[PDB]
Amino acid sequence: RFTPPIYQPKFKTEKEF
Amino acid sequence: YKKKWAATEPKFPAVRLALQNFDMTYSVQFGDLWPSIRVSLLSEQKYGALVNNFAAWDHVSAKLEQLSAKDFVNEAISHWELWACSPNLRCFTFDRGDISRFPPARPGSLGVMEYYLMDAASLLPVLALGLQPGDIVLDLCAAPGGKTLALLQTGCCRNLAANDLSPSRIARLQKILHSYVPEEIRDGNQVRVTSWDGRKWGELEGDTYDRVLVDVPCTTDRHSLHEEENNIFKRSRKKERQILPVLQVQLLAAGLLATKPGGHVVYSTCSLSHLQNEYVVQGAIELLANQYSIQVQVEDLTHFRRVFMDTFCFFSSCQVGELVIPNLMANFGPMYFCKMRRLT
Amino acid sequence: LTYFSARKGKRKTVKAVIDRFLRLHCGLWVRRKAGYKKKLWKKTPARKKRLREFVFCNKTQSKLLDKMTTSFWKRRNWYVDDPYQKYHDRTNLKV
Amino acid sequence: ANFVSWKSRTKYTITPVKMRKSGGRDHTGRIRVHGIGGGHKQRYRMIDFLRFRPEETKSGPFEEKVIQVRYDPCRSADIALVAGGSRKRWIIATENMQAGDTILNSNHIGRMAVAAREGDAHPLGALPVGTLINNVESEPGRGAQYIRAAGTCGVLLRKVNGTAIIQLPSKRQMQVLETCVATVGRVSNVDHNKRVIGKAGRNRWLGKRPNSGRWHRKGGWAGRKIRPLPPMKSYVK
Amino acid sequence: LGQIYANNDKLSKRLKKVWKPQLFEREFYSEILDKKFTVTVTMRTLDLIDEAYGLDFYILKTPKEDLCSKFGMDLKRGMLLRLAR
RNA sequence: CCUCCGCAUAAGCCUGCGUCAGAUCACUGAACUGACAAUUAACAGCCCAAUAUCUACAAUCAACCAACAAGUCAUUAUUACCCUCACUGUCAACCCAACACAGGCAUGCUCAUAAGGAAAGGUUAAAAAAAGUAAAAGGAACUCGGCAAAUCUUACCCCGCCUGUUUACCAAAAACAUCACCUCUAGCAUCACCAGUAUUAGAGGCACCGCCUGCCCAGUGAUCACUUGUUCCUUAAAUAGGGACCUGUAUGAAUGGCUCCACGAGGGUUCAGCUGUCUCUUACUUUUAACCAGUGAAAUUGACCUGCCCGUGAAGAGGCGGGCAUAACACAGCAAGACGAGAAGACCCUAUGGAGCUUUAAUUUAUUAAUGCAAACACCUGCAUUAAAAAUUUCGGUUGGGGCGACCUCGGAGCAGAACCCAACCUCCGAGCAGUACAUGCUAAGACUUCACCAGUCAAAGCGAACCUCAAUUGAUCCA
RNA sequence: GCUAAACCUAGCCCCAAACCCACUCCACCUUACUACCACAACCUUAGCCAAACCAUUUACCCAAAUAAAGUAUAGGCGAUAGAAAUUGGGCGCAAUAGAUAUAGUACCGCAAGGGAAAGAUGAAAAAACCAAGCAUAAUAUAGCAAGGACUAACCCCUAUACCUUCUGCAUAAUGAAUUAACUAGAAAUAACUUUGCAAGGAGAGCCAAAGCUAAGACCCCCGAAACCAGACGAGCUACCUAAGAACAGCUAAAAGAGCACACCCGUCUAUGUAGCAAAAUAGUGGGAAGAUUUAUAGGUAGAGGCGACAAACCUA
Ligand SMILES: C[S@@+](CC[C@H](N)C(=O)[O-])C[C@H]1O[C@@H](n2cnc3c(N)ncnc32)[C@H](O)[C@@H]1O
Ligand SMILES: [Mg+2]
Ligand SMILES: [Mg+2]
Ligand SMILES: [Mg+2]
Ligand SMILES: [Mg+2]
Ligand SMILES: [Mg+2]
Ligand SMILES: [Mg+2]
Ligand SMILES: [Mg+2]
Ligand SMILES: [Mg+2]
Ligand SMILES: [Mg+2]
Ligand SMILES: [Mg+2]
Ligand SMILES: [Mg+2]
Ligand SMILES: [Mg+2]
Ligand SMILES: [Mg+2]
Ligand SMILES: [Mg+2]
Ligand SMILES: [Mg+2]
Ligand SMILES: [Mg+2]
Ligand SMILES: [Mg+2]
Ligand SMILES: [Mg+2]
Ligand SMILES: [Mg+2]
Ligand SMILES: [Mg+2]
Ligand SMILES: [Mg+2]
Ligand SMILES: [Mg+2]
Ligand SMILES: [Mg+2]
Ligand SMILES: [Mg+2]
Ligand SMILES: [Mg+2]
Ligand SMILES: [Mg+2]
Ligand SMILES: [Mg+2]
Ligand SMILES: [Mg+2]
Ligand SMILES: [Mg+2]
Ligand SMILES: [Mg+2]
Ligand SMILES: [Mg+2]
Ligand SMILES: [Mg+2]
Ligand SMILES: [Mg+2]
Ligand SMILES: [Mg+2]
Ligand SMILES: [Mg+2]
Ligand SMILES: [Mg+2]
Ligand SMILES: [Mg+2]
Ligand SMILES: [Mg+2]
Ligand SMILES: [Mg+2]
Ligand SMILES: [Mg+2]
Ligand SMILES: [Mg+2]
Ligand SMILES: [Mg+2]
Ligand SMILES: [Mg+2]
């Protein structure tokens, strides 16, 4: 009766110009 | 529907249920006599061999005499003098304390079985009828037989009426009378076999029979204790017992409506239960004295009792009629029989 | 039934079919009556004879039987003295 | 698993030796005994249960003097330190062994019964019949195995033609030879049974752990019904 | 190592079975090696030795396959070397 | 103005706010990028020639006294033995929690600082919300309940003896454990139990203590004789007789009930006070809020130019019908509607779907132990039997609201009006044969048929003989 | 006019041919990548699944293509299984494709293990238009957004969104914010159709009483809880083992004592509920010299461990 959260991989957020 | 129940009733076998009902009821009725009746009931039923008169009766009599078995009715008739009992009936039984079983019945020279094995108790109500030649006999409950065969063996009956509600049971009745009684005696309406409601007979035929035998459906005491399947005491079939006592009165009454004025009716029950022994007969007699207004008197069979005192034991506390109780010395089926004639 | 075998990749016949039925070359199938060996004391003689006879099968039964059986069983066989030789071909059949 | 027993000492000494607790675990590492856990750290004192052990290059019946009688963690019975010749060893103490008592150890089987003094050790054949005895051996030169708990005593019941019947404290007979030796009397710390563990803490100190919470219906299986008499069991009300 | 059916009926349960031979430790003398050996053997081996009329004959006659023993082969190697030399 | 924090070591981390140059909530800069620096052993790590041999007496200011659970710290003999300070850790604002996270985190010193820090981006003073402070008269009238605030009470009842333990993340208990008491099993050594031994060890039950509650030992005479029982010797075998034996031990309950001290964040009741719990709410402060400035999410979303009443949709309309209303456009509130949003769906049923548990469900005995027979001369191997302990699989269908079941196939009766078929469901009556032949032999045109198939039914002619009744009365394949 | 769009070539796939690399100095099985001191390997696969359940049973590589032949045979004789003698470079992909691959990297997990994304000038850099979303440019009664129209955008009249599962269903119930790309009918017998040849057809085998040979044309996608085999896990928690450490003050005949810090736990209330936080905060409470709490190392492993039994805990 519990659902664990899921993280999206970090590479997308660390994108630069 | 509710699948789950807080407390479920214990799964008693039907034979145990019969014993339970018998223990809580007959204990109060019989007192100290009840244990001896109980022990006999749970024990084996001793049998008698009724010789077929239509077979070579003399040879069979000689045979059964060789096997140390005595005919009880003959010896009873010998000391009977110190209404008349039904003649031309011969049933051999073993003496008290001799428990040996009679050899099974085999077909004779004439092509009929030479004797019929049945409880000698069940032979008493036939003897209770004062059967005379050229008499018309009504038997409201015939199937499976035994008593009917005995009535035929008497040879005093001009016409026979055999009736039973269940065609299943009348089938075996047909079988036994076919196999025992030759076709020569059947002929045309000398034996009439019918499968209708016994209650209807009262309004169907009236003042038609000089002799009637009423063998009403009972709790079948010995049969209930032994037989598991189709037990009357099975808790599902409880409803039947509630409508059991009234039915008895109805059937009895039909007989008393069909009998001739001064005609003799004998009523028999296979049970010891007072509610279906005496309560029924008093209920029936009051019904017909009030509603229909017919005077009926009941004879005492104390004279009848004293004759078969050597062969049978009799319960002494019965108001009217006679009841036979099983004892291990002389084991015979529990049965009540009473004789009555309607005055007008 | 097996449409493609795992060893050879070809169809397979249902052997249940072959030990119960005879197929005639024309396209008919022959069977025995069910229960022809069963409880013969209670059966009547006419009933008994109706049981002994070898009968044909209707179109759908015949179709199903042909699908359940390979082309080998459908070829023409010239057995020496088979008692079913005459029945292999039809005679005077217009539709 | 990586398990080594602590019982690796091979040379007899008097000095207390450090024990390792097991916790009811094996070499396998899994529990095999329930209700054992860490209590008070204890040092083991080796006991010489071979009472007749004469000194190196020495023979015959010898004598020792009692020096001390001291509490032991590793058993119920009290222990006595005894010296004699140039040897000290731990032994099991009897009822009445105070310091400075003198003890005899012999292998001599006399024709007549020897002195039924307490604390001294004779062959069973030497001892009279009916005498209270302890620390008995099954076979000669094996060592004491049988009566070595607090306040426990067996008795010599019969001696006939090279066989001695002794009854253990379980009131059960045992066959032994007379060549085997037994010390006389009842063992120390009588009323060890009369000791009242005050509280749960006391038991935890003694290295015990509590009984499991789980409910048991019965440890013994029900008597199996027979084919003639099934209905007689569980006959409903 | 095999399987069996429970009561020699194919309709019963299938079960894993292992049949192991009975073993006996027995003493032998090799004539060529002039040495007493004590080896673990079966009745079969004892029977083959009897039929070959001695241990040496048994070892020398029997091929590699039937011997089924590294030690059997080593005995053979020694004996053959002794005959050669 | 704040400090229950700090400084250090350890443990963890690995250059992670030193300098200089560019570069980009906040500086056009820095806790960004690149380049350059740095942490120096005395602290700490990293040890030891051999074989024997020694090592009874706690700690607590160890003194007096006092124990129990019985305790961290020692050598000697002989042989061998002469070179020197190497190597590694040493920084920081730092670790485990996805984060510059109100969480987690051992020891020493400081117990409030000599050390370390900053709750307020600016304004205004709405509502609703959070946290405080005060309150006339009254003092539980509030409420499931004195929950909360207060104030800092008293007497009991139920349960559990108590300290203790438990569902980490909805249950702290009356459950578990527990001292004590009771039952069962075990007569013994070098890996558990155990360097143990029946005042012991294991497997359980109940829950301390204190009391009441304990018998199928054979009866009568009187430790004595008969009468029983159990064995034998008879007895064809019993009515059954004759001998032998039962006085070398002896009770019994993991039984039930009743008080009582102490204790409990346990459940209930109660005295006295007390208070904004309430009558009946109010005022102020802080947080939030609303405005200006910077940064900037989430569930959600068929398209929407998105009204009210009545009817329809049976219930249920912003959108259909009939009326009524109606310039456009922000911001603040509210929660009646949008069958409002979000979820590992609460309940009922279904699946020839799973899984856990139990057993007297079916299949077994692969495993373990015992016993027997072979084999071999105590073990091992094969065969068999008896138990333990397991394993694999299943849990048909219809009908039933206060039950404790009735049914499942075939033929009738109430319903069926006149070719065929068809009054559901339900309520009732029967059948699982019997009697008679023994040509109830063989064969064969053409047909009927319970709506399929399977089954079932009638039959001319012919070959050979002779001068059936019955409404149902029944059972495929494989296989034996 | 922004955000964008557009690209061809890295490389890769299936074949054929051919039997492959094991590598300067130093280091590397102890805590791998650390100069330098007295134990040992071989042991029937099971299960899902099919049988519309399930219990015997249910194709899996064994050394020449074809044929014999789905024949003999086996089998709850059923599902199904199944011989032998004998014969003899490209009508490929081209950056959501093709390998996962720019790479077994970054990242995620204690570990076994999981596992990405993306690039584009020109010979030389020593040289124009199009998705959604928005802006240019907010809006004016009235209503599935349109249609009929009209001089005229609206005004007039007509008009109950789509898909899917139900007999109706307007609407009821599931599904869709929108754009781009990607994302789902695979094959036999037998028939038919069109050819060649014809009592014969076929480039051995097979069929044939007009047949036989060849071709054409018919059989989807995503989703459980499970079961079994082999590895990996006790840095959290349960329990144990070794060697440690902590517990102020006050009362007490001195104790699993009492009050009460630090510490450990979590009774009751309120806040918080995508939070500070995948369980916290404020206050109030329970224990606080003991069956106490706690740091370090080691052990027990899933047909299992551990358990003061809560079906508790064994990396949310
Ligand atoms: C007790 S038996 C008769 C005794 C037996 N025939 C004899 O002579 O010993 C009576 C039978 O009557 C039958 N029955 C039931 N109802 C009936 C009725 N209404 N009329 C007649 N007989 C009836 C029952 O089936 C029952 O078996
Ligand atoms: Mg206990
Ligand atoms: Mg318990
Ligand atoms: Mg130093
Ligand atoms: Mg400062
Ligand atoms: Mg600030
Ligand atoms: Mg502000
Ligand atoms: Mg307000
Ligand atoms: Mg006030
Ligand atoms: Mg009130
Ligand atoms: Mg009120
Ligand atoms: Mg309160
Ligand atoms: Mg308690
Ligand atoms: Mg909880
Ligand atoms: Mg806890
Ligand atoms: Mg709680
Ligand atoms: Mg309890
Ligand atoms: Mg407590
Ligand atoms: Mg707001
Ligand atoms: Mg703003
Ligand atoms: Mg969201
Ligand atoms: Mg409406
Ligand atoms: Mg709407
Ligand atoms: Mg608004
Ligand atoms: Mg559901
Ligand atoms: Mg299933
Ligand atoms: Mg169903
Ligand atoms: Mg009808
Ligand atoms: Mg039909
Ligand atoms: Mg004819
Ligand atoms: Mg299946
Ligand atoms: Mg399927
Ligand atoms: Mg790619
Ligand atoms: Mg890829
Ligand atoms: Mg556009
Ligand atoms: Mg309009
Ligand atoms: Mg559906
Ligand atoms: Mg809807
Ligand atoms: Mg650990
Ligand atoms: Mg615990
Ligand atoms: Mg305390
Ligand atoms: Mg306290
Ligand atoms: Mg429980
Ligand atoms: Mg439970």
Residue numbers in the entry:
A (entry chain d): 36 to 52
B (entry chain A1): 27 to 108, 123 to 384
C (entry chain 3): 94 to 188
D (entry chain D): 61 to 297
E (entry chain X): 87 to 171
What are the paper's exact sentences on this?
Here, we determine the cryo-EM structures of mitoribosomes isolated from human cell lines with either depleted or overexpressed mitoribosome assembly factor GTPBP5, allowing us to capture consecutive steps during mitoribosomal large subunit (mt-LSU) biogenesis. Both the GTPBP5KO and GTPBP5IP mt-LSU assembly intermediates reveal several trapped assembly factors: the MTERF4-NSUN4 complex, MRM2, MTG1, and the MALSU1:L0R8F8:mt-ACP module.
Furthermore, the GTPBP5IP mt-LSU structure features GTPBP5 and the mitochondrial elongation factor mtEF-Tu. In our GTPBP5IP structure, the G-domain has GTP in its active site and is wedged between the L7/L12 stalk and the MALSU1 module. The Obg-domain protrudes into the PTC, thereby displacing the A-loop from MRM2 active site and expelling the MRM2 N-terminal α-helices from the rRNA core, while the A-loop folds into the fully mature position. The partly unfolded H89 in the GTPBP5KO is folded in the GTPBP5IP. This folding is coordinated by the joint action of GTPBP5 and NSUN4: in the presence of GTPBP5, the extended N-terminal region of NSUN4 inserts into the rRNA core and temporarily displaces the P-loop, thereby breaking the P-loop interaction with H89. Thereby, the L7/L12 stalk stabilizes the “state 2” conformation of switch I. In this way, the rotated L7/L12 stalk stabilizes the GTP-state of GTPBP5 and consequently, a GTP is bound in our structure.
